[PDB]
Swiss-Prot record, chain A:
Species of origin: Saccharomyces cerevisiae (strain ATCC 204508 / S288c) (Baker's yeast)
Modified residues (N-acetylalanine): A2
Disulfide topology: none
General function of this protein: Subunit of the V1 complex of vacuolar(H+)-ATPase (V-ATPase), a multisubunit enzyme composed of a peripheral complex (V1) that hydrolyzes ATP and a membrane integral complex (V0) that translocates protons. V-ATPase is responsible for acidifying and maintaining the pH of intracellular compartments. Subunit C is necessary for the assembly of the catalytic sector of the enzyme and is likely to have a specific function in its catalytic activity. Reversibly leaves the enzyme after glucose depletion, causing the catalytic subcomplex V1 to detach from the V0 section.
Miscellaneous comment as given in the Swiss-Prot or TrEMBL entry: Present with 21114 molecules/cell in log phase SD medium.
Topology versus the membrane: Peripheral membrane protein
GO molecular function: ATP binding; proton-transporting ATPase activity, rotational mechanism
Protein name: V-type proton ATPase subunit C
Main location: membrane
GO cellular component: fungal-type vacuole membrane; Golgi membrane; proton-transporting V-type ATPase complex; vacuolar proton-transporting V-type ATPase complex; vacuolar proton-transporting V-type ATPase, V1 domain
Complexes and interactors: V-ATPase is a heteromultimeric enzyme composed of a peripheral catalytic V1 complex (components A to H) attached to an integral membrane V0 proton pore complex (components: a, c, c', c'', d, e, f and VOA1). Interacts directly with VMA4.
Family stated for the protein in its record: Belongs to the V-ATPase C subunit family.
Pfam families: V-ATPase_C (PF03223)
Record localization: Vacuole membrane
UniProtKB/Swiss-Prot annotation, chains B, C:
Phylogenetic placement of the source organism: Eukaryota, Fungi, Dikarya, Ascomycota, Saccharomycotina
GO CC annotation terms, alphabetical: fungal-type vacuole membrane; Golgi membrane; membrane; proton-transporting V-type ATPase complex; vacuolar proton-transporting V-type ATPase complex; vacuolar proton-transporting V-type ATPase, V0 domain
Keywords recorded for this protein, A-Z: Hydrogen ion transport, Ion transport, Membrane, Transmembrane, Transmembrane helix, Transport, Vacuole
Name of this protein: V-type proton ATPase subunit c
Coiled coil segments of this chain: none
Location relative to the cell: Vacuole membrane
Length: 392, 150, 150
C-alpha cells in the first residue's frame, strides 16, 4: 500500500456459518484456511467466539440489530475522543492507543483472551439490556472526560490572565508583586497614588514634567516600581481632586495611566487569584491523564462486546442455522489490509448470494471521491458476507 | 556555419525541455509530500524521466565536437545541423510532455498505489521520442563528416 | 565578431538564470522565515545552488576572447558563437527550473522539517543540464582557439 499508512495492528472481524467452505480454496475448513492460506500465511487468527444469550423472539432479533449498529457507532465516537485527548496532550504516547495494551496485555493477544469478558456483563442477562447498559457506561465515561477537559481549558485562561498581572505588559497589568509602603500611600486623608505607564523613550520627559503637569503633586515621588520591556511604571503621589487633571494631562503627552490605587485587600486578592489558578490547573492535568487511561480500558472492553454481539446477532438474522456461529477475529499485519479484504470477498461472498455481490473493490482514504468503501448501511454498495473492518 | 549551430541547438533545446519537466512536476510533488511523506520515492520517478533526455543529448553533441574545429563548408555543416536539431526537438518536446502528465499524475501516484504502473506508462510513451531523435542523429553524425565541400 | 557573441550568450543568459533562481527562492524563504526561524540554514542550501552556474560561464567566455583573432573565418568564428550559446541557454534553463522547485520546496521545509532532503534530491536534478552545457562548451572552445585562421 501507499494510499494509507499503518504501523499498528489492524483487525477484520468475520463471522461465517460453521458449515461454510472457501471457494478460493476448496478442500479447506474455514479455521484451517485463516491460519495457513490467508495473506501469505502471515495472518494471526484469534478466538472471538461467544455463545448464545436469550433472544426475545425473531421479531425482537430485528429490533436488536438496529440498535447494535447505532450503539457501535456511538461507542466508537467516544473511544476516538478519549484517544484524541491523550494524544493531544503528548504526556502519553502518540504512537500507541492502536496497539496499546488493555489489561496490560498486548491488543491482538487481548482479543485472543476475549471470549465474552465479565465486568458487569453476564451471559444470563437479556440482550436488550446489554445493548442499553453498555451504551450508558460508555456515554458516562466520555462525558466525564469532556467535563474535566472543559475545566482544564477554563483553568489555562485564568493562569494566563493572572501571570500577565504578575509581569506582562501594561494594558491590564495590576500590581501586587510590589508591596512597598514607600512606593504607595495608605491610611491617608489627602493623598492617593496614580500609576503611570510610560514609553521608555519618554521616561526622561515624564521625570521633568510630572510635578508641574497636574497641580498639587508630591515631589520626589518618581520611582520605577516595575518595568516590562516596552513600558516603564511609575508611582506618583497627589491630591484626590487633582487625579482627574493628571490622567487627562498625561494622555496628551502620550503617557498611558493605569488606574490603580493602593488598598491591602486588592493586593492580597490579586496574589490569591494567581495561586488558585495554578493549583486548579495542575490538579486537573494529573486527574485528566489518570482518568482518560482508566476510562479507555473500560470503553475498549465495552466496544468489542458490541462488535462480538453484533456480528453474532447479524449472522443469526441473515443465516439462521447453525445456532452457534464461527466467529474469528483476524489481526492483520500493516499494509496487507488490501490483500486481506480481497481474499475473504472472493472466498466467502458466494454464500451471501449473487445479487449481494458487487465489484467496487479498492480503497480511497483521500477526499477526492466517497466510492470504494464498504458498509451495509449505504445503498451504494454492501458487504457480501458478515465482515466489519476495524481500524484503531 | 550551420553545423556549429547544430551543436548549440542540441544543448539549448533539450536543457530547456528538461527544465520545463522538472519545474512543473516539482511544484506538484513538493506540495503533495506534506500530506504523506511516504510518497518521496514514488514522486521522484516522474522527475527522473526528464533527466534522461539530456544524457542522450550529450552523446550526439560530443561526437559533433570531434568532427569540428576545422573550417568546413556547406556539406558537413547542414548534415551536422540536422543531427543537432534531432536531439534538440525530442528533448524539448518529450520534456514538455512529461511535466504536464507528471503534475496531474502526482494525484494518481498519491491515491493509487496500484495504478501507479499506469502512471509510469503515460510518461513512458513520451520517452519513445527521445530515442527517435537520438538514433536518427547518431546515423547522421557518422555520415556528415566529409569536411569542406560546397 | 562572432567571438563577441560567444562571450555575450554565455554571460547574459546564465546570469539571468541565477537571478531567476535566487529571486523566486527568496520569495518563499522570506514568507517561511517568520513561521520557523531556526530553519534558516536549510533554506540557505537551495539559494546558492543556482549561483555556481555563472562562474562556469564567465571562465568559458575569458577563453573565447583569446580565441578570436582578426583574420576572420566564418566557420572558426561560428564555433565560438555556438560555444557561448550552449552554457548560456543550459544555464538559463537550470535557473528557471531551480527557482520554481526551490520556491515550492520551502513550504516543505516549514511543515515537514525532517524530510527537507527530499526537496534537495529534486532540485539538484536540474544541475545535470549545466554539466551537459559545460562539457560540450569547453570542447568546442578548445577546438576554436586558433585566433580564427581563415
Amino acid at each position: 500500500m501507499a494510499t494509507a499508512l499503518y504501523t499498528a495492528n489492524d483487525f477484520i472481524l468475520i463471522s461465517l456459518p460453521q458449515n461454510a467452505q472457501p471457494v478460493t480454496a476448496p478442500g479447506s475448513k474455514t479455521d484451517s484456511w485463516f491460519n495457513e492460506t490467508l495473506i501469505g500465511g502471515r495472518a494471526f487468527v484469534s478466538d472471538f467466539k461467544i455463545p448464545e444469550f436469550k433472544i426475545g423472539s425473531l421479531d425482537t432479533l430485528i429490533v436488536e440489530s438496529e440498535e447494535l449498529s447505532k450503539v457501535d457507532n456511538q461507542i466508537g465516537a467516544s473511544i476516538g475522543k478519549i484517544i484524541e485527548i491523550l494524544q493531544g496532550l503528548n504526556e502519553t504516547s502518540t504512537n500507541a492507543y492502536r496497539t496499546l495494551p488493555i489489561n496490560n496485555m498486548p491488543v491482538p493477544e487481548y482479543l485472543e483472551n476475549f471470549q465474552w469478558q465479565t465486568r458487569k456483563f453476564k451471559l444470563d442477562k437479556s440482550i436488550k439490556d446489554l445493548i442499553t447498559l453498555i451504551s450508558n457506561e460508555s456515554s458516562q465515561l466520555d462525558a466525564d472526560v469532556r467535563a474535566t477537559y472543559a475545566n482544564y481549558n477554563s483553568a489555562k485562561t485564568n493562569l494566563a490572565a493572572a501571570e500577565r498581572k504578575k509581569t506582562g505588559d501594561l494594558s491590564v497589568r495590576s500590581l501586587h508583586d510590589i508591596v512597598k509602603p514607600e512606593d504607595f500611600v495608605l491610611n491617608s486623608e489627602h493623598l492617593t497614588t496614580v500609576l503611570v505607564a510610560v514609553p521608555k523613550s519618554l521616561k526622561s520627559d515624564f521625570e521633568k514634567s510630572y510635578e508641574t503637569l497636574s497641580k498639587n503633586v508630591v515631589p520626589a515621588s518618581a520611582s520605577v516600581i516595575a518595568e516590562d520591556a516596552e513600558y516603564v511604571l511609575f508611582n506618583v503621589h497627589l491630591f484626590k481632586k487633582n487625579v482627574q487633571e493628571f490622567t487627562t494631562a498625561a494622555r496628551e503627552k502620550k503617557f498611558i495611566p493605569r488606574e490603580f490605587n493602593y488598598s491591602e485587600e486588592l493586593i492580597d486578592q490579586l496574589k490569591k487569584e494567581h495561586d488558585s489558578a495554578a493549583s486548579l490547573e495542575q490538579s486537573l492535568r494529573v486527574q485528566l491523564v489518570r482518568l482518560a487511561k482508566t476510562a479507555y480500558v473500560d470503553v475498549f472492553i465495552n466496544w468489542f462486546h458490541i462488535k462480538a454481539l453484533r456480528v453474532y446477532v447479524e449472522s443469526v438474522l441473515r443465516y439462521g442455522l447453525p445456532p452457534h456461529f464461527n466467529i474469528k477475529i483476524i489481526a492483520v499485519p500493516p499494509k496487507n489490509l488490501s490483500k486481506c479484504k480481497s481474499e475473504l470477498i472472493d472466498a466467502f461472498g458466494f454464500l451471501g448470494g449473487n445479487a449481494f455481490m458487487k465489484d467496487k473493490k479498492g480503497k480511497i482514504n483521500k477526499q477526492d471521491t466517497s466510492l470504494h468503501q464498504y458498509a451495509s448501511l449505504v445503498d451504494t454498495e454492501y458487504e457480501p458476507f458478515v465482515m466489519y473492518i476495524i481500524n484503531l | 556555419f550551420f553545423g556549429a549551430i547544430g551543436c548549440a541547438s542540441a544543448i539549448i533545446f533539450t536543457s530547456l525541455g528538461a527544465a520545463y519537466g522538472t519545474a512543473k512536476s516539482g511544484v506538484g510533488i513538493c506540495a503533495t509530500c506534506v500530506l504523506r511523506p511516504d510518497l518521496l520515492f514514488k514522486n521522484i520517478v516522474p522527475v527522473i524521466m526528464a533527466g534522461i533526455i539530456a544524457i542522450y543529448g550529450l552523446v550526439v553533441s560530443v561526437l559533433v565536437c570531434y568532427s569540428l574545429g576545422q573550417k568546413q563548408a556547406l556539406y558537413t555543416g547542414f548534415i551536422q545541423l540536422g543531427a543537432g536539431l534531432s536531439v534538440g526537438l525530442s528533448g524539448l518536446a518529450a520534456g514538455f510532455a512529461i511535466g504536464i502528465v507528471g503534475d496531474a499524475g502526482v494525484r494518481g501516484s498519491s491515491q493509487q498505489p496500484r495504478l501507479f504502473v499506469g502512471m509510469i506508462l503515460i510518461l513512458i510513451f513520451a520517452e519513445v521520442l527521445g530515442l527517435y531523435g537520438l538514433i536518427v542523429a547518431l546515423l547522421l553524425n557518422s555520415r556528415a563528416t566529409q569536411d569542406v565541400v560546397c
